[PDB]
DNA sequence: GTCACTACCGGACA
DNA sequence: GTCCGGTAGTGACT
């Protein structure tokens, strides 16, 4: 599927020599756009890790 | 070498 | 944000 919080966009070319071809790109949770597997792989090298802390979870109900 | 194809990314657009 | 084209790379080959 699509990794959590990420978005996948699919498009099809409609004119010119490349009509009918498809373009795919991804949007990260922070809104960074990747048009290629190469630029995304490069980004993932150092940025693919995600961490969690207790403070990220709310166990309380307000008034 | 040519052909067919896939992938990346430049850059036009006002 | 919208959109296509030019180039590089790969691999099979009458």
From Swiss-Prot:
Localization: Nucleus
Residues of the MBD domain: 1-63
Subunit structure: Interacts with MLH1.
Role: Mismatch-specific DNA N-glycosylase involved in DNA repair. Has thymine glycosylase activity and is specific for G:T mismatches within methylated and unmethylated CpG sites. Can also remove uracil or 5-fluorouracil in G:U mismatches. Has no lyase activity. Was first identified as methyl-CpG-binding protein.
Identification of the protein by name: Methyl-CpG-binding domain protein 4
Gene: Mbd4
Included stretch of the parent chain: 72 to 134 of 554
